[PDB]
Amino acid sequence: AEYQNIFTQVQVRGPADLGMTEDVNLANRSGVGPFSTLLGWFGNAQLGPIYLGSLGVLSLFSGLMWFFTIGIWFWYQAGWNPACFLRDLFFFSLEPPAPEYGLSFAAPLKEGGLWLIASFFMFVAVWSWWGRTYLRAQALGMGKHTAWAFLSAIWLWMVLGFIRPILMGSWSEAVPYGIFSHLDWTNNFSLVHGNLFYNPFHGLSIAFLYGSALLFAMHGATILAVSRFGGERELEQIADRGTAAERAALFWRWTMGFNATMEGIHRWAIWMAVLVTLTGGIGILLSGTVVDNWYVWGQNHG
Amino acid sequence: ALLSFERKYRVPGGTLVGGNLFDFWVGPFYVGFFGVATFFFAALGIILIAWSAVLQGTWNPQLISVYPPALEYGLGGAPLAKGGLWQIITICATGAFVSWALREVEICRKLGIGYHIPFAFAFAILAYLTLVLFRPVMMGAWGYAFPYGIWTHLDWVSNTGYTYGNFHYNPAHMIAITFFFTNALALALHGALVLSAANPEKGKEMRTPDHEDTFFRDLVGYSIGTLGIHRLGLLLSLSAVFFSALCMIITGTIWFDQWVDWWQWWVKLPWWANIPGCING
Amino acid sequence: DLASLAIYSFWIFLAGLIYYLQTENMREGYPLENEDGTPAANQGPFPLPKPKTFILPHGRGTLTVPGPESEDRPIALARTAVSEGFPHAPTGDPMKDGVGPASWVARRDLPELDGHGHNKIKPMKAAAGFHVSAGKNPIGLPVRGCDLEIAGKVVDIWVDIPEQMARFLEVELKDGSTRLLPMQMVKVQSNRVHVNALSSDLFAGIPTIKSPTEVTLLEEDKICGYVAGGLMYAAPKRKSVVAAMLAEYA
Ligand code: BCL
Numbered sequence: 001a002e003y004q005n006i007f008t009q010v011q012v013r014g015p016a017d018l019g020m021t022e023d024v025n026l027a028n029r030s031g032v033g034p035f036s037t038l039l040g041w042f043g044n045a046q047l048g049p050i051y052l053g054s055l056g057v058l059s060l061f062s063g064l065m066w067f068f069t070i071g072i073w074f075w076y077q078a079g080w081n082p083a084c085f086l087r088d089l090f091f092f093s094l095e096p097p098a099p100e101y102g103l104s105f106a107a108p109l110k111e112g113g114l115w116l117i118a119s120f121f122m123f124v125a126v127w128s129w130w131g132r133t134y135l136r137a138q139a140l141g142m143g144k145h146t147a148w149a150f151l152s153a154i155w156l157w158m159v160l161g162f163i164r165p166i167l168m169g170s171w172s173e174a175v176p177y178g179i180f181s182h183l184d185w186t187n188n189f190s191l192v193h194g195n196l197f198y199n200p201f202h203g204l205s206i207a208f209l210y211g212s213a214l215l216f217a218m219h220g221a222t223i224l225a226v227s228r229f230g231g232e233r234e235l236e237q238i239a240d241r242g243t244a245a246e247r248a249a250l251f252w253r254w255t256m257g258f259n260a261t262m263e264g265i266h267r268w269a270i271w272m273a274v275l276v277t278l279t280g281g282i283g284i285l286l287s288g289t290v291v292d293n294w295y296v297w298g299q300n301h302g
Numbered sequence: 303a304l305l306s307f308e309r310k311y312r313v314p315g316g317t318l319v320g321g322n323l324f325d326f327w328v329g330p331f332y333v334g335f336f337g338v339a340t341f342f343f344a345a346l347g348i349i350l351i352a353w354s355a356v357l358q359g360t361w362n363p364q365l366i367s368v369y370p371p372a373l374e375y376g377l378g379g380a381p382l383a384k385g386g387l388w389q390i391i392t393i394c395a396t397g398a399f400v401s402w403a404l405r406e407v408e409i410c411r412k413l414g415i416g417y418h419i420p421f422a423f424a425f426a427i428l429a430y431l432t433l434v435l436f437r438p439v440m441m442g443a444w445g446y447a448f449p450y451g452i453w454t455h456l457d458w459v460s461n462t463g464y465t466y467g468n469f470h471y472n473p474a475h476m477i478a479i480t481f482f483f484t485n486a487l488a489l490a491l492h493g494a495l496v497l498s499a500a501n502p503e504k505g506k507e508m509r510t511p512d513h514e515d516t517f518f519r520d521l522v523g524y525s526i527g528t529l530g531i532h533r534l535g536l537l538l539s540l541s542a543v544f545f546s547a548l549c550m551i552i553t554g555t556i557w558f559d560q561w562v563d564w565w566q567w568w569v570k571l572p573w574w575a576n577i578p579g580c581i582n583g
Numbered sequence: 584d585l586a587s588l589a590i591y592s593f594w595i596f597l598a599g600l601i602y603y604l605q606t607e608n609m610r611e612g613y614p615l616e617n618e619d620g621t622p623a624a625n626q627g628p629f630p631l632p633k634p635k636t637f638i639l640p641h642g643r644g645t646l647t648v649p650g651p652e653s654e655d656r657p658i659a660l661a662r663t664a665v666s667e668g669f670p671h672a673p674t675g676d677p678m679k680d681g682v683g684p685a686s687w688v689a690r691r692d693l694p695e696l697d698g699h700g701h702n703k704i705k706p707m708k709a710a711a712g713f714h715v716s717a718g719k720n721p722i723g724l725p726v727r728g729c730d731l732e733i734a735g736k737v738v739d740i741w742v743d744i745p746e747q748m749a750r751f752l753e754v755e756l757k758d759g760s761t762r763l764l765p766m767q768m769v770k771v772q773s774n775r776v777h778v779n780a781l782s783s784d785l786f787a788g789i790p791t792i793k794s795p796t797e798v799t800l801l802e803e804d805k806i807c808g809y810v811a812g813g814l815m816y817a818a819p820k821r822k823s824v825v826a827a828m829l830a831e832y833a
């Protein structure tokens with residue numbers, strides 16, 4: 001048959017790669033980890049090393065404390081019975097203060113006080129994690145595109161749990177820490193606001209979410225179609241166009257009449273995915289604050 | 303016109319049907335046998351969408367809607383006005399999409415490249431056929447397929463979801479969503495990594511794939527690599543659409559209750575997990 | 584109404600973004616030419632972008648794009664038709680001439696380098712400490728063309744050192760000289776390596792490398808363009824699918 005470049009035929013292994021140095025403080029890099037033959041069928045086989053800075057450790061600390069605050073309260077709801085805590089894992093829920101507390105931090109622990117505690121731990125896990133993806137790229141001399149894109153996901157997460165609840169007046173507006181309960185929250189939200197399908201930002205957000213799947217499907221398959229020409233060495237094809245990059249452009253030009261470059265496909269890529277949570281955050285932010293019924297709203301306007 | 307490097311690639315050959323009888327371009331576009339076929343299908347289907355639009359009265363493109371025949375019409379044909387036009391449009395649309403895939407096959411063959419792109423497109427086509435052919439035929443009526451309107455197809459989603467309660471509890475819907483999110487996540491990261499290497503801090507030299515690995519090894523302790531990221535992206539995108547078509551090929555065929563009722567398996571399993579004290583017992 | 588303001592503003596924002604993105608993707612290939620090489624009249628509604636420069640590592644120069652576009656190689660094609668839009672037929676052997684799906688691009692005649700200034704790709708015998716770590720070791724296996732004859736034997740693997748992955752097979756020919764076969768164009772089997780793209784007789788015409796321990800970017804484009812091009816040009820000599828399935832039990 002014909003090799004499709006989905007799975008590696010032959011794995012090769014050399015002395016362990018400690019990585020590029022640049023201005024990374026190597027005092028903070030772990031040693032190389034093991035190799036995984038399973039992982040090397042699809043991607044790289046080598047694990048590690050990892051960098052553990054102050055920011056990374058602070059992030060993993062608060063990330064654990066957030067996780068452990070739901071974990072303590074889930075054990076609690078399960079009547080401290082192990083067999084019960086396993087069967088109802090997906091139905092447990094750590095829930096925000098009741099609507100009458102407004103934005104007060106006076107909630108009793110068992111009535112949304114523990115929710116405010118878990119949130120503070122997640123607020124600090126995420127924001128210190130964001131700082132780590134700026135610093136890791138800075139230490140290497142790279143651009144900050146990753147940290148700027150991670151800002152788009154942080155925007156929607158900050159709107160759901162922080163920005164909208166304050167503008168509305170209560171912490172009850174926020175999302176519960178529960179596996180099934182946060183799906184239930186998502187459903188009630190659409191109902192209460194007059195069919196989120198009529199929020200034109202929810203419409204844009206879906207278009208971009210479909211489009212990201214569309215776009216990565218085209219681009220991943222395009223690059224795989226031309227891996228026979230070194231096509232996945234995209235950095236060197238940016239600096240010195242190969243026949244890989246030329247056949248890729250021309251597949252798309254002959255198909256849909258326009259086409260990209262080996263560098264600007266990645267600009268389409270970043271913006272496709274980042275507009276998902278940018279539009280989405282705007283849509284959610286206008287709900288209950290500026291618009292109460294999206295369906296009724298859209299009949300008036302346009 | 304041509305890109306400055308295009309001419310050396312515009313040679314004869316690669317067709318599947320018709321020799322060189324259609325082996326030519328129109329501007330940037332390649333035609334081939336299936337450019338003709340695609341044109342035939344889409345133009346026919348568009349003509350019929352217009353015909354169905356004048357039977358309805360309006361020319362506003364947000365109001366035009368071609369509905370499937372009613373449920374009582376089972377799996378047979380219906381008159382043009384009462385569902386029949388939908389049925390021919392579905393055939394043309396299917397003919398356009400399939401021909402579009404095969405035209406890409408011709409283009410691949412001329413350019414000497416893998417067939418990954420049309421193959422990935424077939425996953426989108428098969429998802430579409432799940433909603434208008436495989437699921438309706440399995441349910442006994444074309445009337446279970448979605449209508450062709452910009453807002454009515456949305457109301458189909460809402461009506462169909464709320465028929466089985468909260469669709470979120472559909473476990474295959476859960477998986478499909480996880481793939482759509484992880485695809486968007488991975489797409490953002492992959493564009494950002496390449497751009498951050500190609501465009502370092504002002505005044506510095508272009509980075510290398512070695513820096514890209516180091517960045518991700520530093521940040522999370524693993525880097526999938528430049529080839530693995532493109533494989534992952536395709537698999538994530540195709541897995542999302544696969545578990546999408548699956549979540550409906552079972553919805554109203556292998557299962558017809560509220561979808562929340564599926565998760566009471568482990569709870570109320572024949573091992574009688576009495577285990578009181580919690581909400582589930 | 585503020586929501587109207589917001590959605591209205593986002594659509595003005597989106598139009599500008601698509602403008603920026605499309606002009607960004609015009610740094611290669613543009614401005615459009617006619618089928619003879621001269622500038623084309625209608626260039627589209629998008630202007631070229633303001634230039635940008637890459638500083639390449641290891642003092643290899645800069646690159647400013649968009650810049651003037653010249654193929655910088657022989658193109659052994661010929662215009663078939665009078666009006667624009669028809670194929671350009673090969674004037675000779677397109678496999679040897681490197682046109683159509685055998686095409687290559689006049690890239691720099693130096694090797695790609697890792698982050699340390701070393702050759703990115705080397706044979707395993709000259710890459711310190713590299714070995715096969717999973718899968719069928721293809722070294723020693725006979726190498727079979729799509730006409731189902733044996734064309735040579737694997738004598739080494741060429742490895743991407745920083746990325747730890749196989750990129751070429753080194754195949755010794757009957758004359759005792761070797762060639763490189765793209766890893767993505769070969770199937771590695773229990774008792775052979777099968778190459779669908781090439782009949783056994785076109786192996787000798789694979790373009791050769793000038794140094795037996797490095798491969799330059801230009802050499803890579805020549806080797807890979809050729810192998811890929813056998814798909815279209817070697818079809819006369821490609822046995823059928825059942826013919827290959829039967830070849831197993833021979
Ligand atoms: C996929 C799962 C569901 C579904 C659920 C939703 C939901 C929920 C929403 C949409 C929305 C949209 N859907 Mg729908 N939709 C389905 C089936 C389809 C099919 C199809 C033939 O199968 C098509 C073509 C569309 C098309 C569209 C667009 C009108 C819109 C933006 C999507 C987007 O950018 O996607 C990614 C594709 C691209 C980025 C490429 C560009 C494609 C363009 C935009 C298609 C235009 C279609 C045109 C108006 C109608 C056919 C035109 C012919 C020429 C006659 N839907 C099925 C039933 N769809 C969103 C919206 O805003 O609706 C009003 C929205 O909120």
Ligand code: BCL
Nearest residue numbers: 153157186187189190196197202205206209280281283284
């Ligand atoms: C009945 C339910 C309603 C509905 C109600 C809602 C509501 C409510 C919301 C959405 C949202 C979304 N909906 Mg809707 N929606 C419905 C119907 C649909 C349909 C469909 C076919 O029917 C589709 C495809 C969509 C599509 C979408 C997406 C475009 C969008 C979410 C983007 C995203 O990736 O978020 C996922 C990404 C994030 C949440 C960002 C995460 C960032 C943080 C920082 C991550 C932290 C990780 C943490 C530390 C954990 C660490 C773990 C360890 C490291 C392992 N909707 C119907 C009408 N939908 C959202 C939106 O934007 O609306 C405008 C939203 O709030």
Ligand code: BCL
Nearest residue numbers: 426427429430459460462463469470478479546547549550
């Ligand atoms: C109230 C509604 C219910 C609900 C009920 C449903 C229903 C009902 C459906 C889904 C389906 C989906 N839902 Mg749900 N769902 C809800 C809430 C959500 C939320 C959320 C955050 O709340 C999310 C993220 C999702 C996510 C999703 C996806 C898994 C899936 C949609 C994509 C898909 O399959 O595309 C597949 C892609 C396609 C069908 C595209 C095909 C494109 C074709 C091949 C080509 C078109 C070409 C075009 C005509 C060209 C135009 C011209 C050119 C532009 C020039 N749902 C709520 C609770 N969900 C759908 C599904 O699984 O469908 C299979 C579905 O039908």
Ligand SMILES: CC[C@H]1c2cc3[nH]c4c(c3C)C(=O)[C@H](C(=O)OC)c4c3nc(cc4[nH]c(cc(n2)[C@@H]1C)c(C(C)=O)c4C)[C@@H](C)[C@@H]3CCC(=O)OC/C=C(\C)CCC[C@H](C)CCC[C@H](C)CCCC(C)C
Nearest residue numbers: 059060063064125126129149150153273274483486487490
């Ligand atoms: C642009 C939109 C998309 C996006 C973007 C995005 N997200 C990002 C980035 C970007 C560009 C990053 O830079 C950043 C990152 O570093 O990615 C690798 C991140 C990331 N996005 C993530 C998640 C995420 N993104 C999401 C969505 C999206 N992200 C969008 C689709 C979602 C959802 C809901 O769809 C999630 C859940 C993280 C993986 C990461 C941010 C990590 C972070 O802030 O972490 C702090 C928390 C901790 C350090 C630790 C907490 C503790 C654990 C929960 C413990 C439990 C473990 C358990 C006990 C072990 C079980 C083991 C088994 C093997 C048994």
Ligand SMILES: CC[C@H]1c2cc3[nH]c4c(c3C)C(=O)[C@H](C(=O)OC)c4c3nc(cc4[nH]c(cc(n2)[C@@H]1C)c(C(C)=O)c4C)[C@@H](C)[C@@H]3CCC(=O)OC/C=C(\C)CCC[C@H](C)CCC[C@H](C)CCCC(C)C
Nearest residue numbers: 210213214217344347395398402422423425426450451452
């Ligand atoms: C499998 C994963 C993802 C995927 C893959 C994918 N799609 C692809 C490709 C790939 C790899 C292509 O190569 C192909 C392409 O060439 O893209 C530029 C394509 C493509 N994906 C498209 C759309 C699309 N893909 C989508 C999704 C995705 N595509 C998946 C998430 C979606 C949605 C809703 O999620 C849409 C809208 C097109 C942009 C393009 C194919 C163009 C094509 O087939 O053209 C021929 C047909 C016509 C020009 C018109 C026919 C018109 C009909 C006869 C009348 C209209 C009928 C229709 C039923 C009406 C619907 C009304 C709506 C309101 C519902």
Ligand SMILES: COC(C)(C)C(=O)C/C=C(\C)CC/C=C(\C)CC/C=C(\C)CCCC/C(C)=C/CC[C@H](C)CC/C=C(\C)CCC=C(C)C
Nearest residue numbers: 067068070071072119120123160161162175177178179182
């Ligand atoms: C054996 O078990 C042990 C004890 C070891 C465990 O630890 C087990 C642990 C578990 C079972 C944990 C289970 C956890 C979950 C199921 C969590 C699932 C989480 C979700 C579904 C997340 C929902 C989305 C959350 C969002 C959108 C949050 C946004 C919040 C922002 C942080 C808001 C900003 C900050 C605020 C409001 C804090 C304000 C307070 C200040 C002091 C500033």
Ligand SMILES: CCCCCCCCCCCC[N+](C)(C)[O-]
Nearest residue numbers: 030031032033048050522523524
């Ligand atoms: C995305 C998956 C993340 C997996 C994290 C892998 C981190 C491995 C760290 C290697 C540690 C090696 N050593 C010798 C220090 O133990």
Ligand SMILES: CCCCCCCCCCCC[N+](C)(C)[O-]
Nearest residue numbers: 007008009038039041042043718
């Ligand atoms: C998404 C990561 C998945 C990694 C797991 C890979 C699965 C193993 C597939 C083995 C293929 C080996 N073989 C024989 C085809 O070469």
Ligand SMILES: CCCCCCCCCCCC[N+](C)(C)[O-]
Nearest residue numbers: 255256257258259329330331627
């Ligand atoms: C907005 C999403 C749907 C857009 C429809 C397709 C856009 C046209 C792009 C094809 C360009 C062909 N052209 C004119 C460059 O030759």
Ligand SMILES: CCCCCCCCCCCC[N+](C)(C)[O-]
Nearest residue numbers: 200203204207211268271272275
């Ligand atoms: C950066 C990529 C840009 C692609 C543009 C996609 C636009 C989708 C338009 C869908 C229309 C949605 N809406 C609001 C009319 O309901």
Ligand SMILES: CCCCCCCCCCCC[N+](C)(C)[O-]
Nearest residue numbers: 257258259601605626627628629
């Ligand atoms: C919804 C995404 C929109 C895709 C269309 C973007 C631009 C298409 C037109 C490109 C012009 C081609 N041209 C003339 C420069 O060669």
Ligand SMILES: [Fe+3]
Nearest residue numbers: 223234492496
């Ligand atoms: Fe890429």
